[PDB]
Amino acid sequence: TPWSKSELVRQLRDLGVRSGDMVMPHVSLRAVGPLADGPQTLVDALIEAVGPTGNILAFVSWRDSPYEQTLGHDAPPAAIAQSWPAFDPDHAPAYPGFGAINEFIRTYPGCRRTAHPDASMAAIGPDAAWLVAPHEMGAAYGPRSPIARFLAHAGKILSIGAGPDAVTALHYAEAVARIEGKRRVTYSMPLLREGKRVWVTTSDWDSNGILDEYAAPDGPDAVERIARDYLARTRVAQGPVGGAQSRLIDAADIVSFGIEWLEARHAA
Ligand SMILES: CN[C@@H]1[C@@H](O)[C@@H](O[C@@H]2[C@@H](O)[C@H](O[C@H]3OC(CN)=CC[C@H]3N)[C@@H](N)C[C@H]2N)OC[C@]1(C)O
Numbered sequence: 001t002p003w004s005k006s007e008l009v010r011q012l013r014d015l016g017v018r019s020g021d022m023v024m025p026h027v028s029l030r031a032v033g034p035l036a037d038g039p040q041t042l043v044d045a046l047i048e049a050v051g052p053t054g055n056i057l058a059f060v061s062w063r064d065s066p067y068e069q070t071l072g073h074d075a076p077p078a079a080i081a082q083s084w085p086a087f088d089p090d091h092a093p094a095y096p097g098f099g100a101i102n103e104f105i106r107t108y109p110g111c112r113r114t115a116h117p118d119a120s121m122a123a124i125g126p127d128a129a130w131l132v133a134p135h136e137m138g139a140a141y142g143p144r145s146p147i148a149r150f151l152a153h154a155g156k157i158l159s160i161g162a163g164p165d166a167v168t169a170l171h172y173a174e175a176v177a178r179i180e181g182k183r184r185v186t187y188s189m190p191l192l193r194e195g196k197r198v199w200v201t202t203s204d205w206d207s208n209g210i211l212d213e214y215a216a217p218d219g220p221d222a223v224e225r226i227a228r229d230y231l232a233r234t235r236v237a238q239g240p241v242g243g244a245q246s247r248l249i250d251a252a253d254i255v256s257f258g259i260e261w262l263e264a265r266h267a268a
Helices: 005-015 039-050 078-083 101-106 128-132 146-151 170-176 222-233 251-265
Strands: 022-027 036-038 055-059 121-124 156-160 184-193 196-205 237-241 244-250
Touching (some): 005 244, 036 039, 039 055, 039 101, 055 128, 055 146, 146 170, 146 251, 156 251, 170 222, 170 251, 222 251, 244 251
Parallel strands (some): 022 055
Antiparallel strands (some): 156 244, 237 244
């Protein structure tokens, strides 16, 4: 019997979501199980749960981000530069690998979209415009990003059947951690500025592992390491949303822990 919107709202209330909250969801729809009207049922429940003064923030990225195609070059390679689609925030599909629910979030009426094509964030609520802009190339997840503003606004991270690697806000801890050997990446994104397509090349922190030892593709990254150590140590509201085991995490607290975690393990 598929979960109804009102059943999900009650479960979110049980978990500790309150009207007015600013929530960042990370969702496994397979863990959630069948929904009355598909993924939209959970989007609707999240919006009801946070109320008209609350907010939803999601890391949605872009299905067609030219990340690997431009990585490590000081300019987009010519064949990429000449034909890649410009990122059009109100028309760009979410990256499917960060959750199929994100395409439902970002197409929700009134949803806003940040201008960083690879780190793109989607936001719903009165603070959505303040959350999504600015989002400059060179500020993907650290200071001046939407995640930084989320962290300054008592954000809660809502993990709904998702693994400990799916805690994007921890990339803020990596950005500001005073440790040696931090990995950086250089890539190019095609933006729209006044309807004109403009290639921007930038460097930023490597979001696939802030240090070498965390960036092997067949091992856990720093986000997962930090998140597992935090969840092993911290009382966190836990309970079902649909069929999925869920956690409601204080975003400022886990990011503070992560900064401490990184700085304790690596010299300045
Ligand atoms: C759309 N462009 C993408 C580009 O943004 C970047 O995505 C990052 C992404 O992997 C990270 O998620 C995975 O991280 C790891 C360890 N590597 C294991 C499983 C995931 N939790 C996320 N935390 C931060 C993202 N920025 O690289 C891939 C890409 C497809 O090119």
